[PDB]
Ligand SMILES: CNc1nccc2ccccc12
């Protein structure tokens with residue numbers, strides 16, 4: 027565990043993280059994909075061996091000794107708001123199980139279902155709150171990665187609000 031488990035946010039490419047493991051915003055088929063998934067494929071391509079897994083689950087594959095946790099959020103183009111919300115919460119619960127099993131002291135995590143799987147909606151609050159629900163009972167240092175300057179400010183404010 028980290029000696030004082032914390033949440034932080036960084037605005038940078040998650041492929042350049044400084045944590046002991048990474049969560050991929052994966053597709054169910056283990057394909058290279060686009061966005062976070064393509065950057066993860068370029069950095070850790072070995073981790074895509076038998077990485078395919080259903081929506082709402084996470085599957086870890088080692089790149090050397092570095093763990094890549096493939097977490098499959100729902101595509102809100104295809105899911106109803108209600109079923110989508112359930113699967114998005116479940117994907118994060120499976121990430122917390124993996125992070126705990128691996129015994130890491132830190133994890134780099136993107137906001138699942140906020141990019142091409144968002145169904146064209148702003149899902150910052152929805153995705154972040156499901157992230158907190160899952161990860162609050164873990165003792166890893168969590169570092170959330172984002173691209174957008176306004177998202178960095180909103181994520182920082184939400185972390186600081188809890189103190
Ligand atoms: C931290 N997030 C990201 N990491 C890598 C590539 C990305 C491409 C598009 C959007 C976000 C990206």
Ligand SMILES: [Cl-]
Pocket residue numbers: 037038039042
């Ligand atoms: Cl960067």
Ligand SMILES: [Cl-]
Pocket residue numbers: 051138139140141142143144
């Ligand atoms: Cl996405």
Ligand SMILES: [Cl-]
Pocket residue numbers: 172173174177
């Ligand atoms: Cl972003």
